[PDB]
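From the methods appendix. Each design record in this collection lists the tokenized structure first, followed by the designed amino acid sequence. Records were kept in a plain field format so they could be parsed without special tools. The example shown here is representative of the layout used throughout.

RECORD:
FOLD TOKENS (94 positions):
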């Protein structure tokens, strides 16, 4: 069951550039998979949300810090979309 999907920009870890990715949030277990919007069917990666912390912080930025301390910086297109994503991620992290 897919709780939420949509696109966000995601910042790279070393080079700080922002790329559009499609995100799919699932809840049992809680994963945020992300995919190249124009490319491969296979996911590029997945974020394990159990125990993560998400915070509002370019604008409409927010950050996820996972249980193993990885930081992901994301940017929504509007403040409303940021608010919705943060709320959905928090709920799924429980
Ligand atoms: O090559 P992998 O998939 O191991 O890692 C890349 C990161 O590369 P490095 O670890 O820094 O070598 C990339 O970061 P930089 O390009 O270095 O800024 C990062 O942009 C990659 O993200 P996508 O999967 O394409 O969404 C991707 O990082 P993610 O693990 O997916 O967030």
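DESIGN:
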């Amino acid at each position: 069951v897919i709780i939420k999907q949509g696109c966000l920009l995601k910042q790279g870890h070393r080079r700080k550039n922002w790329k559009v990715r499609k995100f799919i949030l699932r809840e049992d277990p809680a994963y945020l998979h992300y995919y190249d919007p124009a490319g491969a069917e296979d996911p590029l990666g997945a974020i394990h949300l159990r125990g993560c912390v998400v915070t509002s912080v370019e604008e409409n930025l927010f950050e996820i810090i996972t249980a193993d301390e990885v930081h992901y910086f994301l940017q929504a297109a509007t403040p409303k979309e940021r608010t919705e994503w943060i709320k959905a991620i928090q709920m799924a992290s429980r």
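APPENDIX NOTE: The radius of gyration is 12 Å.
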